[PDB]
C-alpha cells in the first residue's frame, strides 16, 4: 500500500547523516562557485530521485563581501593614532580544517565602508526599550558614539536600526558567553559551547520583507531595473563588525562613565559592564577605531525547484522549502535542513517510482542567498506570486532541523495546529523515557501549552526565514518545525555555535544527534506534513482553529489599550467592532466545519469549492494595501516584531499604532490612527469570515 | 428547451418602455428618499421576479449638494460691487414637469465654497494640450484667474485638476453648441437638443479609482474610520459651477485680451472666443464672481444586490450591474440601463421558476452614488474584494442602453471579443434596410474595424463607469455595450440632453427609440453575454486575442519612444524585453488553445484547472503595488488616461512615463522611469503568460 506509513518507513537516519556529510565538507557561501556546484548536484540527485523535473532558477541580486586584500577589523588606538590593540582577522578554524580555503571571515553583511573614530558606549542588546533606558532614564546620548551591543534576545539587523536611530556612528557586535556558553558544556571541539575566538557572521539588513534591495516588487531576472544602491531598501548608514568575547573582553574592560542601570546589563565576562561614554580616566584619551571595507556587488544566487506533479489537483502546490547557503560549512544551519528534505524527496521519488503520485503537486525548492536576507525564496516568490496565490496550499519551510536535542518546536498557522496534533500522535518519540511512547506524548510533557492541559506549545510564526513571502506577503498557511533545547536548561535563544565556523558535521554528529534520530523525527514531521497537506481529499486545515486564537489577539490587544483608559474615554476607542468580527468569524467558521463534515461527500465540486475556501481562507487574511509603511506585511493577523525581525505580533497594525503612543506628541492624531487600525482589523476579520459562508 | 434562445426570446420592448416609464417619473438622486424607495420597490419586484436573495448593501458616503436656501450663482459685478448680470438659478423645467419637486438644480457635485471675484480667462476644453498652448506657446498666466472652459473631449474632474495646477481661482463650466446641438435639429422639447437654458451637472472629483473620499481601500460601513476632509481623496480646491450657453453667451461677448489661437479653439456662439484675460477696454474694470455655497455630507446609498445560484459552480460569479441613482430623472442615464437590467433579471427568473438554474452563480446589481464617484459599485468591491478576486468571473456593466440610434458599440477587455462577435452573429439587427440580417452584419457595415476587414470596432474600456473597481482594481473580466451614434454625423461624444433636467422618458419614447428596440437589441447582448458567461461549460473566453492586441500596446508603445532616437542610445532604452513577453505570451496563448480544445472532455478537474486559467488571466495583468501614485489602478495594460478619465490607456505605466518627456529637467532620472516601467511590463505580460502553461 502507498499511504503516509510507506512514506514515513522509507525514511532512514543513515540516510540523513550521508547527506549531512556530504553537504558539509567545503564552504557553500551564497554567490560562491562552490554553491552553484551543489545547486547542480541537487539538481541531478533529486532528477535521480524520480521528480518530474527540476531546474534552476537564478536571479542576479545584491550580496555583501569582505575585501580579501583588505581586512575588516577594529583597534583601540592611542592619542598619537598608534592601534595598540587589534581584533583578530579570522576565527581559529576546527581540528582538520585549519587548512580548507574559502572560510569567509567574520563580518557584518551590507556594511558600509569606513574608519569611524570614537568613544564606546555600551548599549546591552541594543532593544528598543535599551535605547529608551539609555536616551530617557539615563540621560546618555550616542549621537556621534560608537556602540557595542551583545548579540542575543533579537535580530541584529533591528539592534543596528535601533542605533542607526540612536545617532551611533558605528556598531560593534559581539557574542557575550552569559548568551553564548552554557555553563558546564566545553568549548568546541570538546564540546558544543562558543569558544573567545568563535564570532557568529549575519546580515544587519532591515528588509521588511522586500527580498533583492535593489528589486523591491519584481524578480531580479535578466532585463530587471535596479534601484541605485543610495535608494535601495533596507541597507544600513554606519559601519558594523562582529567580533567574539575575547576581542570584546579588551574593549569593555577599560569603559568608564555610568555604571550599567541594573543586573539585566551585565554579561558573563570579568568587567564592569559600564555604559560609558568612553574609558576611564587613565585610557580617557584611547578611541576605538572601525576598518570595514567591504563591498556590496551584484551576485547571481540559484535556487533549485523540483517538481512531483498531483495525479488529481495538479494546479494546487504543496512547497516544502529551505535554503542550501551557509555562512561557513552549515552543520547545522541549513545543511541539517536541506539533508532532511533530500531524504524527504527521495523517499517521495521511491513511492512514485512504484507508480503513486500524490493527489495535489509538490514543489520541493533548495532556496538560495537566504543568510543575506531571504533573497531566492523572495525573488522566486515575486516572480511566482499569481501562480502562488492562486494555487499555493501551505508552505513548510525547512531550515535546521536541530538547535537541541530535549523536544519538538512546532510554529505555524492556526490552520495548521490540528494537522500537526494528528500527526504527533502517530509518529515515534526519539526520546529517552519515552520509548514506545508517541511524540505528541513526550513533546507535549515536555512542552506543555500556557493554555491548555494535555496540549502541546505551537508558536506563532515570527520571521528571518523563508516561510515569510509565503506567509506575510502572500497569505500561504505555513508551518515550520524542528528540534530544540530546553528554555528551562538556559534561558539563551538558539544554539552557541550559530553562524560561526565551529558549525561541522562534527558537531553535530558528536554533540547533538548522534544516531540521527532527532534528524529522521523531523524528517517524519516536516514529510508528513507535507504528505497530509499533498494527499489527502480534504484540506487537512481547521478553521475553527483561527477563532480560538483571534479571540486570544483581540483579548491581547484590548488589554495593551486599557492601560490607558482616560484616552480611551476621550478619543472615543472601541474595540467593539473587531469584537463583533471575531465572534462572527468563530460562529460562521463552526457552521462551515459542520457543512465539511455533512457536505455530499459523492461531490468533488462541492469538496473543491470547500477545499478552495479553505485554501483561501490564509489568503482572505491580505490586505493588499499592506502595513504602515511595510508594503511587504501584508498579513493583518501577523507580521514580524517592528522591534524584533524574529519574533511575530499579532494584530500588528493596532499593536504598532499603540506602541510607545503616551510618548507622542498628538494624542488625538495617535489615538485617530489606533481607531484606524482596529476598524482595518475589524473589517479584515469579518472579511475573512465571509469566504467561510455559503458562496450563494 | 431552457437555451439561450428560451432566454432571449422571454425578452420584450414593452416591458423595457413600461419600466422606463415607472423609473423616470420623479428624481432619484442618490442620498435621497425617493432613491431609497426606489432601491426598496427594486429590491421586491427581483425577489418576485423569482431570485434566491435580493439584499440591499448600504454605505455611508461623502456626498455634496447644493444649499436649498443659499443658491449658487456667477455674477458680472462693476467696480461699485454691483452685479449686473446674474446666472440662472435653475433650468426652465420641461412641459408637465413645471411642478414637479426636488429638482436639484445646476451644480459641479464636491465644489469647495467661496466667493472668488476676477478676470477670465477662456482655456478652451482645459485639456492638457490647452493649457500647454496658453502657458508654453501663448504666454498666457492663469494664476489668480477665473477660467471658464467648454465641456466636451474629456471629463470635467481633470479639467478642473488642469486648472488647478494652472493655478486658477475659479473654474467656469459650460455646455457650447458647438458640441451640444446638433445642426438641424430642434431644442427639447421639440428635437433632442440641449436648449440654451440646459446645464449639465456631473461630479469633478479626481478619485483615480478609490470610491467613497473619506474611506480609501475599504467599506464605508457603520465602524469605518472616516478621514478628515483636508486628507479626503480627489476633492477639488477651486470653486466650480456649470452653466448654459444662454449665459455663457453674456461671460464671453465681453473677453478681450488675445485671440483664440486657431479655429479648434472657437465654439459656435457669436463671441469673439478671445482667451483674455478679461473683458475689451469699455468694461476692462468688471470683473467676474462666482457664489458657492454647496456643501458635502456623509449620507446614507443603497445597493440592491441580487443573487441566482449557480448549478454546478454557486463559487463562480458573473456580475450584471448599473447604476439607479440618477441628476434629475435619468431618463437615458441611468434608466435607459436599469430598465434593461429589469427586464433581464425578469426573463431570468421565468427560466428559473419553470426549474432551470444557470450553470454558475449570477449576482444582480443596482448601484447607488455612481453620479458622485461610482461610490455604491466601489465601496461594495471593497466589502467584498476576497470574494470577487478569488471567484469573479466577469463584470457586464449596464448604465445607458442608448446615446443614438445608429448601431452598437461595445468596449471590453479582449477575453471577450470572440464571444462578443459569435453572440451578435445570432441576434437580429435592428436596423432599418438590415431587415432579416444579423446585429454583427449592421455592427460590422456602420462600424467598421480600423484594423480588419469584414469584423466591427471593440473599443478598449476606458472609465467613468461602474466596471472601474472590477476591471482595473480587481483584475475581473469587463465589458459593456450600448446603442450609439453616428461619429460621422456629428463629431461630439455623448448625448446634448446629458445630465439635464431636459433627460425624461419623453425624449426616449419620442425621439431615441419609439418602439423600444433598440433597448431590446441591447439587453439581448448584454443579457446574452451574461448567459453564456454563466451557462457555457467552458468559459467563453479566447486568450488568443489579448496576445494579438499586446503586440499592436507595444506596437504603439514603442512608437512614441521612438519619437526621442538620441534619448534612446544615451539611456540604452530597449522595448526588447517587451517585445520578447509578447511573443511568449502568443506561443504559450496558443498551446493553451490547442489543449482547451483538445482535452479529455469527461474530466470535471482539468476543466476547471483550464477554466480557473480562463478567469485568472485578466486577474494576472493586476500589480498589486498599483501604477505610480494611484494605487487603485492595478491593471499593468489598461488604465484610465490621466488627461481623460473617460479613455483607456494601454501600457499606462511607460505611457505616462514618456509623456511631455522632453520637458524634464532631468533627462536621466526621465528615461530611467521610462525603463523600469518597460521592466514592469515586460515582466507583468510574461507573468500572466506563464499562467496559460501546463500547471506542473
Ligand atoms: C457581525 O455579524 C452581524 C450579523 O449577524 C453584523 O450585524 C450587522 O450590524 C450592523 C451594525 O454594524 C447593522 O447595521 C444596521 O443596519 C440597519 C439596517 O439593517 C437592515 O437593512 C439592511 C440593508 O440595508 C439589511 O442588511 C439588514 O438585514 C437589516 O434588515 C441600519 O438601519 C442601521 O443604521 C442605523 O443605526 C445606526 C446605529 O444606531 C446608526 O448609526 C445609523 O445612523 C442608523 O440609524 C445599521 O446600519 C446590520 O443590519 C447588521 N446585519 C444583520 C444583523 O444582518 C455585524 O456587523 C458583524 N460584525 C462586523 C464587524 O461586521
Ligand atoms: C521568453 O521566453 C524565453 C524562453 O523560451 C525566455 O528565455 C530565457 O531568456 C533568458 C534571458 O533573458 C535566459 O537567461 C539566460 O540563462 C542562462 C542560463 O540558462 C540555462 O540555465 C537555466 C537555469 O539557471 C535554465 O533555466 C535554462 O534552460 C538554461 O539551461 C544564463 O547563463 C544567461 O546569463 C548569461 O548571459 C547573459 C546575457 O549575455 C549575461 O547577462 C549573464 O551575465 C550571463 O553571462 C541568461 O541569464 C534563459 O535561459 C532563457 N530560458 C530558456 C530559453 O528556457 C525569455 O526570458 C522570455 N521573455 C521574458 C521577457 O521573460
Ligand atoms: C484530527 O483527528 C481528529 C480525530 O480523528 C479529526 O476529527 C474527526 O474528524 C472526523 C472526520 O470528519 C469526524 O467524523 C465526522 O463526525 C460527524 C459527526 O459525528 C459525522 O456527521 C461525519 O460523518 C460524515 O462523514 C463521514 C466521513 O468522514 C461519512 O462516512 C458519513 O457518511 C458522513 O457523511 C464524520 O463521521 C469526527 O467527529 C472528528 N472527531 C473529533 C472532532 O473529535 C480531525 O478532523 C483531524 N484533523 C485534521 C484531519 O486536520
Ligand atoms: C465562436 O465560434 C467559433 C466558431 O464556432 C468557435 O470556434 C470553434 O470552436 C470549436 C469548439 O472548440 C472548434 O472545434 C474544435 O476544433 C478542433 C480542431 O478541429 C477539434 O480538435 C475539436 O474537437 C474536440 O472537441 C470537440 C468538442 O468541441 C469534441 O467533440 C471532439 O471529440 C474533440 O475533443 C473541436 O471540434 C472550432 O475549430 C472553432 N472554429 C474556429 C476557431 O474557426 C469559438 O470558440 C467561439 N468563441 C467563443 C465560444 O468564445
Ligand atoms: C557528495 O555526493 C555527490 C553525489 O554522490 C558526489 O558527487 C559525485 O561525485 C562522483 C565522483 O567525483 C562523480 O562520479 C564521477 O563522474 C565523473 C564525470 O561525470 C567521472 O570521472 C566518473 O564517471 C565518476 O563516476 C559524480 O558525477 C558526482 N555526482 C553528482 C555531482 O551528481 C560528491 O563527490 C560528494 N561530495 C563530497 C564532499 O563527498
Ligand atoms: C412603479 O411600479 C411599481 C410596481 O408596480 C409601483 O409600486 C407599487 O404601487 C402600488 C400602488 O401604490 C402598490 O400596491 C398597493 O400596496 C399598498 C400597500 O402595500 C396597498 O394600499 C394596496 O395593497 C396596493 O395594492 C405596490 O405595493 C407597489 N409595489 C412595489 C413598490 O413593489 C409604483 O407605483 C410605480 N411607480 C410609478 C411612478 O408608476
Ligand atoms: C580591495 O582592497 C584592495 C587593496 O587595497 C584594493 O586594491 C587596490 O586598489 C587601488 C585603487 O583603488 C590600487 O591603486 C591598488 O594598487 C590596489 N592594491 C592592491 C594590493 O591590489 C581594491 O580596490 C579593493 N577591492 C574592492 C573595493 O573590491
Ligand atoms: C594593528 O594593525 C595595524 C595595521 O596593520 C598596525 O599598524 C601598522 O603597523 C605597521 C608596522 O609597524 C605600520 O607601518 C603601519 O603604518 C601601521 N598602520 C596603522 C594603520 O597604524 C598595528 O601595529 C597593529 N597593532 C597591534 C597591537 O598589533
Ligand atoms: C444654507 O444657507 C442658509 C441660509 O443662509 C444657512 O442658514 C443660516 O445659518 C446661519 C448660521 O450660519 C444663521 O444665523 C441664519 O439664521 C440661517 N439663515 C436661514 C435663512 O436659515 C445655512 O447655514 C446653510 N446650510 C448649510 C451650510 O448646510
Ligand atoms: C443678481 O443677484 C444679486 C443677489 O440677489 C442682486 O443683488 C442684490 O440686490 C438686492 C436688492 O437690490 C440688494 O439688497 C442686495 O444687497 C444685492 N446683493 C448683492 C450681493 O449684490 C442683483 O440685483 C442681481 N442682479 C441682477 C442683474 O438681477
Ligand atoms: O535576513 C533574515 O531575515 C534572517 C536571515 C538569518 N535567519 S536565521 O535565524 O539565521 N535562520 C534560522 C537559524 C537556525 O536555523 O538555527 C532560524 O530561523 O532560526 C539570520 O538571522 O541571519
Ligand atoms: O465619477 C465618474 O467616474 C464618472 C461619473 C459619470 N459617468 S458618465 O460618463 O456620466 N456615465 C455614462 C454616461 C451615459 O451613460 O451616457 C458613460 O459612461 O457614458 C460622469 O461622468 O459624471
Ligand atoms: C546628542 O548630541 C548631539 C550633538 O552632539 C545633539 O544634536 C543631540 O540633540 C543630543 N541629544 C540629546 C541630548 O537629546
Ligand atoms: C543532548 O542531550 C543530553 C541529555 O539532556 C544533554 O545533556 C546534552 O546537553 C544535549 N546536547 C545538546 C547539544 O544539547
Ligand atoms: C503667474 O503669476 C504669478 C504671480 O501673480 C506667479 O507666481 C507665476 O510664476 C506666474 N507664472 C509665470 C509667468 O510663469
Ligand atoms: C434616429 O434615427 C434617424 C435616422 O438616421 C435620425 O435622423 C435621428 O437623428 C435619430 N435620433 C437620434 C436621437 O439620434
Ligand atoms: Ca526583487
Ligand atoms: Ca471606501
Ligand atoms: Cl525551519
Ligand atoms: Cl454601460
Ligand atoms: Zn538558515
Ligand atoms: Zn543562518
Ligand atoms: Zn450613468
Ligand atoms: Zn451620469
Redesign the interface.
Known sequence: KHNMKAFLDELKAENIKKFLYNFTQIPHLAGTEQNFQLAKQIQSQWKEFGL?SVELAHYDVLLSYPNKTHPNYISIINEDGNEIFNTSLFEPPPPGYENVSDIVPPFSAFSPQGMPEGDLVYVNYARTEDFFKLERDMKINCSGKIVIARYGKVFRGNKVKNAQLAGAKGVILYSDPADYFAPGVKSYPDGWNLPGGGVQRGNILNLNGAGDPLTP???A?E???RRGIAEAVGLPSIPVHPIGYYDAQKLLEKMGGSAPPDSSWRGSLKVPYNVGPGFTGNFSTQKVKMHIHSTNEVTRIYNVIG?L??A????R?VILGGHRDSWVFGGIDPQSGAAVVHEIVRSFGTLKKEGWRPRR?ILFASWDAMEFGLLGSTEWAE?????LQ??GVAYINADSSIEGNYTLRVDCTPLMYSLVHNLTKELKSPDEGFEGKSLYESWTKKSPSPEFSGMPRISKLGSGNDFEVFFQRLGIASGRARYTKNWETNKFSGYPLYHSVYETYELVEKFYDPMFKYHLTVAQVRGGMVFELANSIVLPFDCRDYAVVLRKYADKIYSISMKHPQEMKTYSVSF??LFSAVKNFTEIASKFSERLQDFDKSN??VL??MN??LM?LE??FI???GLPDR?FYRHVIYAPSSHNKYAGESFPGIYDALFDIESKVDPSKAW?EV??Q???A??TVQ??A??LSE??
Chains 1, 2 share one sequence.
Not at 312 to 315: H, T
Open positions: 518530474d516588487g519584481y524578480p531576472n532585463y530587471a531595473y517538481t506533479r498531483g488529481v489537483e495538479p494546479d502546490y503537486t516572480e511566482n506570486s499569481r501562480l492562486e494555487r467593539d467592532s468533488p465540486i473543491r469549492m478552495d475556501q483561501f489568503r482572505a490586505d493588499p494595501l508594503p485617530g481607531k484606524r482596529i476598524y482595518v475589524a473589517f472579511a475573512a465571509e469566504t458562496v450563494a
